[PDB]
Write a protein that binds this ligand. Structure first.
Ligand SMILES: [Mg+2]
Ligand SMILES: [Zn+2]
Ligand SMILES: [Zn+2]
Ligand SMILES: [Zn+2]
Lengths: 551, 107, 177, 171, 97, 112, 280, 84
DNA sequence: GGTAAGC
RNA sequence: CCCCC
DNA sequence: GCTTACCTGGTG
């Protein structure tokens, strides 16, 4: 299920280990170096370049060409490349954490501002939950504004023991946009702390110290919150919408990456050349801007990295942010195949658990049946019927993977079925199907029904089942979902079947009764005054399917 | 148990944990005026022995983590003088079953 | 592919892969302290070709017994004899086993299980590594110098004299082919 | 060397085989998959022992597919070569670059330069040989080699060998 | 049609586990990835026809797995990776709890 | 007593409206809001800030922020929650997923 | 928010209610271990009325001519008068029924008798009478032992929890406390004979059915109880109003109510609109 | 860690979910041409066949009930009581 | 444009 | 947008 | 005790 046999063992995910990329790992997992803002045109020749939007990272042209892997569009996950940053830059997502870590460590020697020699600190270091522990250590260390050489000994308060020298005064760090500014102590020494400066002291934090802060020696060292080697995501993440040959619109990410690239080439040029040093600070802060603005383009610090159109550039963070987001809109909820929707109509002649399905829908929706000696003859007949007669079939899936399209196949008239083949046949009477009415507020908003293929364009349902759905026939639309396994259809029939939902466990009472015409007519039928003579009594008895035949 | 009128000076409050294994508990006179355990909404909380606790965890196949928790500062935890780790059995009346017992681990 | 009994430990930690030698640095998979199916710690099983030849022979014989039970509802000579058993139990396609049996039958020093048992007894008193014990049963040495050169691991472990007593005994047990 | 190892293979069996002679087919698929195989990790998985007692265990039926996956716990004879292992073998091929030696299931190749200077290749001889002041090495001759190193090659391990050092060579 | 969040909630309430997976996988975007056994990443350079596996910079080739995940999650993970986050997917439990 | 009062309060809002919910539902909500020792709001600050797995918590409200913190603190999601199995397209340990199904070769033989 | 907060709550194979971390939320689902679809409002008789009427309805005194069981009610009636050995049994029966009434009056302080419980006992007896064609003008073949000990044994098989230890066995005793109160109150010797007029065959069928029905009623390990609760509180919330103004036109009488009060609650809002003490 | 037979404490009755999964699993297998342990007296639907195999208690499957700690109780579909 | 938990 | 309980 | 940073029903 992602096409074509893989010899690799298939397993399920049991654990997800979150972490941060070391720059060394980004280089290790890279396929292409990435160095030109240019995406394509080999000078002018329409084909992708050795710089951006890959050699290598994946493909376009629905032409296999995916670097040696050579697997082609559906099969190929893209491959990451990298871009080496001319100067280190903070990751937006970690700007605050960086501030807090600087606020916990001596900005000179990299030691923790407090230790075991402080009673309040000991209480915090004891904290089991890393998140709560870092919050405590910070609340303590933030105020500590000197890297004490010696502190009073555990026994004698008059005497002191050397902890870990340095003795340097710490700044009072304030965030100025994407910059971190310090104020040491006449009037205070005000200076902006460089990324390199921070990175360096983060690199100098003891494992014991960064493990005391929320960090991980293996998976997430604090120094990794500072970016140095940027992973370039492959084309599948940033697809180039091709408007048919020599006309292709690249993704916003592709454009942003080109800006990161251009800003970087710029900085690397001045750094190498006659660096005017007050020009260097500009190209540096610009690189910082693009790298920030690529991941998050909704920062408090107003300038909203715009597209030349006046549009604001879709940050990666923006793609994930809920309802329409990646998580909420694509993972928690999906748009799905084997589905149908029409206007619902009511039917007194359908059993409580049946659903009237328009032929057109029945001929579209298709359950895939495995050729077995029990169905071999039946399925053979549906294949013969083709995709246009009601009891029919659309495709025949062979042992040999590929599916036969009965509407086009030259062999569609022939086809001698074999055990194990799947016949994708039309939805038929008594197939269990999931019927739904949005908003789905209850378990009873979705119930399994037995198909009843019928004429006309409406899903027809039994009047009694109207109430659980909270549906009426003033043009309400309802949804149908077709189960595809002999296993999922058993879930529907054995768990979600309409008759199984009769008593609701919300209110602890039944959730379906007799309604409207029948409720009105039942009172009328059952008064003393109401008598029936033979002629009708017989038609009335004949109407009860289960009648014993006894007058 | 120290029953003070208004307040215990911070200077004196420092001496409190200074004598282990003995534990000092400070209660304000005003707090003790009414016995909160007597309230309509307050059920019977019972202090479990180290062995009774061992069994509870065994029988439900639990990590201490997975037990419902009671704060150390909890009016009832303070009343029983519950230490951290101590489990309390809670017998409440149920409108569903007649009686229902919960457990809370003092953290 | 096939897995083992040695439980996976290092998280990411890349791959700090170490070399394998005769400083008895056989893999992680070939450590002295092994863990058997039953869960217990077992010592490494290393076989001398002879020990090895008989293990495979016996294993294949019991397989034909099981295969015939379920079907209801002298070196030159021993060489053809084996090719019959293999053509009966083995998948045919297993050339690796056929090449092995020809090798093992042509290079075993000890024919019978009594002689193999005697070797195995003698060399077990030594308290040497299962690798050195298997090499002392597979390579025929005359002097402790031969043994100690060919099996470098042995070096300070056994006395030159004690080793020489052992090689005299192994030479006496050597089958007259 | 030539070890015995406790191992376990995961086999996924299709519903068609969920009949009485099921274990019979699992033990079969185990011998196909595993026996005659070679890994850098374990070496050559030469022969599965105790056929009468191979452990099937229970098999989990897999969610959307009907198949059942068993971890077949077993015990086999393996051959894993090592650097510094002294092996006895027979000469198979022979050239101006050296000679290859059959050692059990694998080949150890000896370079002209990883053999004593007096051993000189003779193109002439039938079959081609390596001769010295008192020795002749050709196809079929027995040699004691010291493995210099190994290479894991998909379904085989090969090695470079020496007969330069003392007590190695013809036998 | 959208089988949304609320719809997912009724399948949960129903206890229709297998129906739910089918609706999100087979009925929508099931995809197959090759995961390295060392870093839990989608690094594996799997050449299927040649049976070549490889995760360079793990120097794998051997410890590799096939996983079935919704393409949108393959996307989510590559997006998180693009933001220096490593969502390492493992096929065994290290915690054992 | 806090839980007892909270139930009384939750009940009284639903019931004043005329509406009826079986006890066990409100009981459960009130219990969830309470097992942590104090009052845990059904908000992004409340329940969503608990020790539950990253991916599950990111599915409600603080999506990206949750995932960054997950990365920096090297969080381990055991995929025990529904949301995690939904994101991974795996059968959740829910209802028909709350147990395993095995073939018994012993009985498989006995049935022949 | 309700759904997202309760998502992961499910009933485990140990009848415990747990979340994704495996933390216990409820030790037994909804305190009783019963599935809400098998719960029906039933009347706990014993709780109300005068002590006199209770005594009339339940007390059987074989040692007293006026308060014995009438020989018309059971065949045993004539020889049961003065039986000290059986009176010790009826003395237990009455003592427990009193103990029950005392306890019910502790649980439900207002005296409210109607509570949703599993197994509609009214119907079982009703059906037993229509099945065996109960003759309310013929003496019963039941014994006092048949009744007294019969009910006692049934209580032993009303299983919610299983475990061969005191924790589980006590937890089991507890879960069944309120049901057994109803059971004992409905199958008292005086009630069974003088009201229901059951036969041994009929009474047996009743005990049998109560057992079966009770078992059918317990929650199923795997129930996604969390979402269920979230949706059960969610759907009525959907129908509440923002405004209401039922106390408008009278200030100095203000209440928060409806949606706003539901938010104040779920948000554990610190600055609530209508704070109020009710001092007794 | 597997709770031994004599020490099993879970319900003797098959859960509504266990049943649906068995019938589903067995129908699936039957539909994939798996061997049938019942005499199909003219039956054809893999679910209707599975139901027969269930009713005749000739389903060779076992449920592995997992407790929240990881330990488990294996239960045969033979010994499990199908009421419902 | 409403609430709270940051500084 | 323009439609919904 | 003020400013920030999160959120705001369902389909089509
Ligand atoms: Mg309408
Ligand atoms: Zn590729
Ligand atoms: Zn310092
Ligand atoms: Zn890797």
């Amino acid at each position: 299920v992602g096409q074509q046999y893989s010899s690799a063992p298939l397993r399920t995910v049991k654990e997800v280990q979150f972490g941060l990329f070391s720059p060394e790992e980004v280089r290790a997992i890279s396929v292409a170096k990435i160095r030109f803002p240019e995406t394509m045109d080999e000078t002018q020749t329409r084909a992708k370049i050795g710089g951006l939007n890959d050699p290598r990272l994946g493909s376009i042209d629905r032409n296999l060409k995916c670097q040696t892997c050579q697997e082609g569009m559906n099969e190929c996950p893209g491959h990451f490349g990298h871009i080496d940053l001319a100067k280190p830059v903070f990751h937006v997502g970690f700007i605050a954490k960086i501030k807090k870590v600087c606020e916990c460590v001596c900005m000179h020697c990299g030691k923790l501002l407090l230790d075991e020699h402080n009673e309040l600190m000991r209480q915090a270091l004891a904290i089991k939950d890393s998140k709560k522990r870092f919050a405590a250590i910070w609340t303590l260390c933030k105020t500590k504004m000197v890297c004490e050489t010696d502190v009073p000994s555990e026994d004698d308060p008059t005497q002191l023991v050397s902890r870990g020298g340095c003795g340097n005064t710490q700044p009072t760090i304030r965030k100025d946009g994407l910059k971190l500014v310090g104020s040491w102590k006449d009037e205070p020494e005000l200076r902006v702390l460089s990324t390199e400066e921070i990175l360096n002291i983060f690199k100098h934090i003891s494992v014991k110290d960064f493990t005391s802060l929320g960090f991980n020696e293996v998976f997430s060292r604090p120094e990794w919150m500072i970016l140095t080697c940027l992973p370039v995501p492959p084309p599948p993440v940033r697809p180039s919408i091709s408007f048919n040959e020599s006309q292709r619109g690249e993704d916003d990410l592709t454009f942003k990456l080109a800006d990161i690239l251009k800003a970087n080439i710029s900085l690397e040029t001045l750094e190498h050349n006659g660096a005017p040093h007050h020009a260097i600070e500009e190209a540096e802060s610009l690189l910082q801007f693009h790298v920030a603005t690529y991941m998050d383009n909704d920062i408090a610090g107003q300038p909203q990295a715009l597209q030349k159109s006046g549009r604001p550039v879709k940050s990666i963070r923006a793609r994930l942010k809920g309802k329409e987001g990646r998580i909420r809109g694509n993972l928690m909820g999906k748009r799905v195949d084997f589905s149908a929707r029409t206007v619902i109509s009511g039917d007194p002649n359908l059993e409580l658990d049946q659903v009237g399905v328009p032929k057109s829908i029945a001929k579209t929706l298709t359950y895939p049946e495995v050729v077995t000696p029990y169905n071999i003859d039946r399925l053979t007949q549906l294949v013969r019927n083709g995709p246009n007669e009601h009891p029919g079939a659309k495709y025949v899936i062979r042992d040999s993977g590929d599916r036969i399209d009965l509407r086009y196949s030259k062999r569609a008239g022939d086809i001698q079925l074999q055990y194990g083949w799947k016949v994708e046949r039309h939805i038929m009477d008594n197939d269990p199907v999931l019927f739904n009415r949005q908003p789905s507020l209850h378990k009873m908003s979705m119930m399994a029904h037995r198909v009843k293929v019928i004429p006309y364009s409406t899903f027809r349902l039994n009047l009694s089942v109207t109430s659980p759905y909270n549906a009426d026939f003033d043009g309400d639309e309802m949804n149908l979902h077709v189960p595809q396994s002999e296993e999922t259809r058993a879930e529907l029939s054995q768990l979600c079947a309409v008759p199984l939902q009769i008593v609701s466990p919300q209110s602890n009472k039944p959730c379906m009764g007799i309604v409207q015409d029948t409720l009105c007519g039942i009172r009328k039928l059952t008064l003393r005054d109401t008598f029936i003579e033979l002629d009708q009594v017989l038609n009335m008895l004949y109407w009860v399917p289960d009648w014993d035949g006894v007058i | 148990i120290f029953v003070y009128q208004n307040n215990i000076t911070p200077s004196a409050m420092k001496l409190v944990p200074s004598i282990p294994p003995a534990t000092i508990e400070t209660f304000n006179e005003a707090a003790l005026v009414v016995n909160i355990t007597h309230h309509e909404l307050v059920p019977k909380h019972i202090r479990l022995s180290s062995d009774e606790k061992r069994e509870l965890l065994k029988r439900y196949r639990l990590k201490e983590s997975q037990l419902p928790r009671i704060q150390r500062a909890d009016p009832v935890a303070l009343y029983l003088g519950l230490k951290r780790g101590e489990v309390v059995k809670i017998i409440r009346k149920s409108e569903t079953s007649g009686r229902y017992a919960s457990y809370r681990i003092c953290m | 592919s096939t897995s083992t009994f040695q439980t996976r430990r290092r998280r990411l930690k890349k791959v700090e892969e170490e070399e394998n030698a005769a400083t008895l640095q056989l893999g992680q998979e070939f450590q002295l302290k092994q863990i058997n199916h039953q869960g217990e710690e077992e010592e490494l099983i290393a076989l001398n070709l002879s020990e090895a030849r008989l293990v495979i022979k016996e294993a294949l014989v019991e397989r034909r017994r099981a295969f015939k039970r379920s079907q209801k509802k002298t070196r030159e000579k021993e060489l053809e004899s084996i090719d019959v058993l293999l053509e009966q139990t083995t998948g045919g396609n297993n050339k690796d086993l056929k090449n092995t049996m020809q090798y093992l039958t042509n290079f075993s020093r000890f024919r019978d299980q009594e002689t193999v048992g005697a070797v195995i007894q003698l060399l077990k008193s030594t308290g040497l590594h299962p690798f050195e014990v298997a090499q002392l049963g597979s390579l025929a040495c005359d002097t402790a110098d031969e043994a100690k050169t060919l099996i470098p691991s042995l070096n300070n472990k056994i006395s030159d004299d004690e080793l020489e007593r052992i090689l005299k005994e192994l030479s006496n047990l050597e089958t007259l082919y | 060397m030539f070890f015995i190892k406790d191992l376990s293979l995961n086999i996924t069996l299709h519903p068609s085989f969920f009949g009485p002679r099921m274990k019979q087919y699992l033990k079969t698929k185990l011998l196909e998959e595993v026996e005659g195989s070679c890994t850098g990790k374990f070496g050559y998985i030469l022969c599965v022992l105790d056929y009468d007692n191979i452990d099937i265990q229970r098999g989990r039926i897999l969610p959307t597919d009907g198949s059942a996956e068993f971890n077949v716990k077993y015990r086999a004879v393996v051959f894993k070569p090592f650097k510094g292992e002294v092996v006895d073998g027979t000469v198979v091929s022979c050239s101006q670059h050296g000679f290859e030696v059959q050692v059990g299931p694998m080949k150890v190749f000896v370079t002209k330069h990883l053999m004593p200077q007096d051993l000189t290749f003779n193109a002439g001889s039938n079959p081609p040989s390596y001769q010295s002041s008192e020795d002749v090495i050709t196809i079929k001759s027995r040699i004691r080699v010291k493995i210099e190193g190994c290479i894991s090659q998909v379904s085989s391990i090969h090695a470079i060998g020496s007969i330069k050092e003392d007590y190695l060579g013809a036998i | 049609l959208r089988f949304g969040e609320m719809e997912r909630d009724c399948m949960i309430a129903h206890g229709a586990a297998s129906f739910l997976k089918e609706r999100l996988m087979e009925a929508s975007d099931a995809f197959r990835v090759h995961i390295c056994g060392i870093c839990g990443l989608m690094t594996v350079i799997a050449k299927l026809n040649h049976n070549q596996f490889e995760c360079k910079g793990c120097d794998n080739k051997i410890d590799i797995y096939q996983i079935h995940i919704p393409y949108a999650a393959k996307l989510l993970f590559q997006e998180l990776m693009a933001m220096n986050i490593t969502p390492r997917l493992y096929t065994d439990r290290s915690r054992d709890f | 007593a806090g839980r007892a009062a909270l139930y009384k309060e939750v009940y009284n809002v639903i019931a004043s409206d005329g509406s009826y919910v079986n006890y066990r539902h409100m009981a459960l909500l009130v219990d969830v809001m309470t097992t942590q020792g104090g009052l845990t709001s059904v908000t992004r600050h409340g329940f969503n800030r608990s020790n539950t797995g990253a991916l599950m918590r990111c599915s409600f409200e603080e999506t990206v922020e949750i995932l960054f913190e997950a990365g920096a603190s090297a969080e381990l999601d055991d995929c025990r929650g529904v949301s995690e199995n939904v994101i991974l397209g795996q059968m959740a340990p829910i209802g028909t997923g709350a147990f395993d199904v095995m073939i018994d070769e012993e009985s498989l033989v006995k049935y022949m | 928010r309700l759904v997202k907060a309760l998502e992961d709550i499910m009933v485990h194979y140990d009848n415990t209610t747990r979340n994704s971390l495996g933390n216990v939320i409820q030790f037994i689902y909804g305190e009783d271990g019963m599935d809400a679809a098998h719960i029906e409002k039933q009347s706990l008789d014993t709780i109300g009325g005068s002590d006199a009427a209770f005594e009339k309805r339940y007390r059987v005194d074989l040692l007293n001519t006026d308060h014995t069981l009438d020989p018309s009610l059971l065949e045993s009636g004539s020889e049961i008068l003065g039986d000290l050995k059986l009176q010790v049994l009826l003395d237990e029966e009455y003592k427990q029924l009193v103990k029950d009434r005392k306890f019910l009056r502790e649980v439900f302080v207002d005296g409210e008798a109607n509570w949703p419980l599993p197994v509609n006992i009214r119907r079982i007896i009703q059906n037993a009478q229509q099945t065996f064609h109960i003759d309310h003008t013929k003496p019963s073949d039941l014994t006092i032992k048949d009744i007294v000990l019969g009910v006692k044994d049934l209580q032993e098989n009303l299983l919610v929890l299983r475990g061969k230890n005191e924790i589980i066995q006590n937890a089991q005793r507890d879960a069944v406390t309120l049901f057994c109160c109803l059971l004992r109150s409905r199958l008292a010797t005086r009630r069974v004979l003088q009201e229901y007029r059951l036969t041994k065959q009929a009474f047996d069928w009743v005990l049998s059915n109560i057992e079966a029905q009770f078992l059918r009623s317990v929650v199923h390990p795997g129930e996604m109880v969390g979402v269920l609760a979230a949706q059960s509180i969610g759907e009525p919330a959907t129908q509440m109003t923002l405004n209401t103004f039922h106390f408008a036109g009278v200030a100095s009488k203000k209440v928060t109510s409806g949606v706003p009060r539901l938010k104040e609650i779920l948000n554990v809002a610190k600055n609530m609109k209508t704070p109020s003490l009710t001092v007794y | 860690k597997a709770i031994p037979k004599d020490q099993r404490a879970t319900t003797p009755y098959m859960t509504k979910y266990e049943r649906a999964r068995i019938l589903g699993t067995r129908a699936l297998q039957i539909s994939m041409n798996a061997p049938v342990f019942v005499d199909l007296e003219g039956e054809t639907d893999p679910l209707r066949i599975a139901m027969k195999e269930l009713a005749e208690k000739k389903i060779p499957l076992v449920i592995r009930r997992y407790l929240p700690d990881g330990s488990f109780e294996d239960w045969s579909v033979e010994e499990l009581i199908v009421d419902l």
